[PDB]
Amino acid sequence: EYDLKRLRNIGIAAHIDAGKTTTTERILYYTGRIAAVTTCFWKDHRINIIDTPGHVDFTIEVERSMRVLDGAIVVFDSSQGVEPQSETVWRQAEKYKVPRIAFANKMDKTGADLWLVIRTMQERLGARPVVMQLPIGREDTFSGIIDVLRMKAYTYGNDLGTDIREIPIPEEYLDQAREYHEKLVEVAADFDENIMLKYLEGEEPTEEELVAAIRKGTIDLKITPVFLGSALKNKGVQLLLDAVVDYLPSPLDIPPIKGTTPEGEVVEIHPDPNGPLAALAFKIMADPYVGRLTFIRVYSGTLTSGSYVYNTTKGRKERVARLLRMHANHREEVEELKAGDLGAVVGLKETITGDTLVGEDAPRVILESIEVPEPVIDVAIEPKTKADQEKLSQALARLAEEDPTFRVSTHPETGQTIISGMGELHLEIIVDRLKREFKVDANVGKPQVAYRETITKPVDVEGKFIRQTGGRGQYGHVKIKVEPLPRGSGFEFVNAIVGGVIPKEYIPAVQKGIEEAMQSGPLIGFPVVDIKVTLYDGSYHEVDSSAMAFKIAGSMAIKEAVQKGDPVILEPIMRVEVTTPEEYMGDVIGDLNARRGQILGMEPRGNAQVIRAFVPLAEMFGYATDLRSKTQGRGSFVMFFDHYQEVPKQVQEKLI
């Protein structure tokens, strides 16, 4: 009941509204005649369907979901062929070196041309797609599908899937069918030698030869077999399954994952159920009654239900209580989860999305990197009126655990809770996450940028404090030397008091006091970073001095002594991989250098052209729509924070 050669772990990446969701939903209907990844069966093959992100912008989620799957299907709204975003989604496919096939959906829709896809496929996606099926009909006249591979046709009596009759191709669509059979074998002959020789001598190859050959090609990334249908009208979907088994890869065709030994050495993990074990927990999905199910693709070895696996990313052991394969209607308990297969685990306390798992006495291989995002997008948030402040921070509790990658901070002045993250969308999703499924309605603020502040020249000034007989005598007096530290060298304190000049007891306050003003730079009101303070002189009032009057004695000096060291804003200067069609280069490169950018290289990937840059995050708000407009939607870009840098003189002056 387990042959690695019969699995087929696949995804469904479509432009929104192409039918990512409606194709799957109709894919289960046909499979199930007997939710992250959702196993199922078609002619003696298992087909674990990983879920690919909703919006294809999701990059990181996308990265994962990619890594987790073997084959993949692209769904094209056959109104517009490869859609602008369906164009962008192909980019991701191209990237992660994943074999695939394509689905012309909506052939009933008014606006139903196949060739439209084919043309703008090779034309816009550099695909060299191959035609395997020809419609019988056009719009709402669409009556079937021809398989030019096997030279037969299927018909569809009703818009249901109740009626599918195998019919010999109509005399009408015959001369077209024959031309494309040939033209195809010309692509099969491109892979099999025995096929060419039979094309020439005029011999008909064999269905296997054909399909066998076409498969090497689909797989080895040299084509993209192309079928069509309407998932709405329930036609050609079966074929699409007959496709997947035929062309889409088992976990044995795709290459082994690049895993990293702890010594640095990066070795390759070969799909072997009877060897050391490792897996990837990509999806921490919170079930109802069962609890924290974490979803895992297994690469080597076997997962036994009731065992002790090692969370290699965190470092703590985990116990696998039950092993689940979630199906279309119901769950499933299993004892094994072998290699190349996918599923759900029960237990695993401290295991988050991405964490790698290996088994007890097994090599500690990590599969995912170590990216801890520098916090760059600050967002301010009052509750509704402290009716929703209740379930505000108690809401962050669940959110924090399963995702480490975001600050939470109460802002100095306004006391507004402040959420510090990576990207913009990263933050926006949580608003919908909170103002809806968390029942935390409230007052939101515009994304801000993580400006930090610092000095440049070394200063040397004090910070007294006097409030005598109010209510009992109060007093305290510091004298400090501050100098600027190198970038992202952060804080350093030094105590060079001679002795006795200030009481030993009261230093903590001076420190607690410095630390409290470094949350408010004089330039805007952002955390002062990169500095070296030195307490060296002072005075005290023997009775009047107190833990309060030296917290203030000290705060009054870090505040004051900043506005003297020629203060300076620093800003987040990002790193960008913008994907533009080769035609819009001279156009958007201009866009970067308008946003104080500094272009680095340009290296080709696919029919496209990618460009590495140094735009200030400060100049990035709305860059999506500005590039979607300059590439007519064809563009796409990704950020990866790089460093903090100074702001130029004219940049600062305006910053108030």
User: Rounded to whole angstroms, how far apart are CA atoms 312 and 66?
Assistant: 21
Name the region of 96 (left: φ>0; alpha: ψ -120 to 50; beta: rest): alpha
Residue ranges in 69-108 that form contacts with ligand GDP under rule CB under 6 A: 105-106, 108
147 binds, among ligand GDP, Mg ion, none (CB under 5 to 8 A by kind): none
- The string over 306-318, giving b where at least 16 C-beta atoms fall within 10 Å of a residue's C-beta and e elsewhere, is eeebbbbbbeeeb
Shortest Cβ distance from residue 83 to ligand GDP (Å)? 10
The C-alpha angle with vertex 100 and arms to 155 and 274, in degrees rounded to 5, equals 115
496 alpha carbon, distance to own chain's centre:
49
Task: Name the residue nearer to ligand GDP (CB basis): 14 or 557.
Answer: 14
Is 108 within any annotated ligand binding site?
A: yes
Residue ranges in 2-21 that form contacts with Mg ion under rule CB under 5 A: 21
User: Burial level of 386, CB count in 10 A (0-12/13-18/19+)?
Assistant: exposed
Three-state secondary structure readout of 415-455:
CCEEEEECCCHHHHHHHHHHCCCCCCCCEECCCEECCEEEC
User: Rounded to whole angstroms, how far apart are CA atoms 392 and 395?
Assistant: 5
Task: Name the residue nearer to Mg ion (CB basis): 21 or 416.
Answer: 21
Among 230, 294, 580, 636, binds ligand GDP (CB under 6 A): 230
The contacts found for 147-152 with CB under 8 angstroms, 24 or more apart, are 147/239, 148/177, 148/180, 148/181, 148/184, 149/181, 149/184, 149/207, 149/210, 149/211, 149/214, 150/207, 151/177, 151/178, 151/181
In contact, 338 and 304? CB cutoff 8 Å: no
22 alpha carbon, distance to own chain's centre:
23
Is 53 within any annotated ligand binding site?
A: yes
Peptide bond into 471 cis (omega under 30): yes
Is 107 within any annotated ligand binding site?
A: yes
22 binds, among Mg ion, ligand GDP, none (CB under 5 to 8 A by kind): ligand GDP
Q: Which helix (H) or strand (E) holds 246?
A: helix 237-246
Shortest Cβ distance from residue 228 to ligand GDP (Å)? 10
Interface with ligand GDP includes 563 (CB under 6 A)? Answer: no
Shortest Cβ distance from residue 231 to ligand GDP (Å)? 4
Is 24 within any annotated ligand binding site?
A: no
136 binds, among Mg ion, ligand GDP, none (CB under 5 to 8 A by kind): none
Among 599, 590, 596, 598, CA closest to 652 = 596
351 binds, among ligand GDP, Mg ion, none (CB under 5 to 8 A by kind): none
* H runs (alpha helix) in 126-156: none
Site string for Mg ion, 18-47 (x = CB under 5 A): ---x--------------------------
Task: Name the residue nearer to ligand GDP (CB basis): 31 or 302.
Answer: 31
434 binds, among ligand GDP, Mg ion, none (CB under 5 to 8 A by kind): none
Residue ranges in 11-50 that form contacts with ligand GDP under rule CB under 6 A: 14, 16-22
Is 18 within any annotated ligand binding site?
A: yes
Shortest Cβ distance from residue 15 to ligand GDP (Å)? 7
Q: Choose the stretch contacting ligand GDP; rule: CB under 6 A; options: 228-236, 335-343, 562-570, 640-648.
A: 228-236
Is 19 within any annotated ligand binding site?
A: yes
Q: Tell me the site size for ligand GDP, rule CB under 6 A.
A: 15
Task: Name the residue nearer to ligand GDP (CB basis): 16 or 638.
Answer: 16
Per CB under 6 A, residues contacting ligand GDP are: 14, 16-22, 105-106, 108-109, 230-232
Positions touching Mg ion (CB under 5 A) are 21
Residue numbers belonging to the annotated binding site for GTP = 14-21, 51-55, 105-108
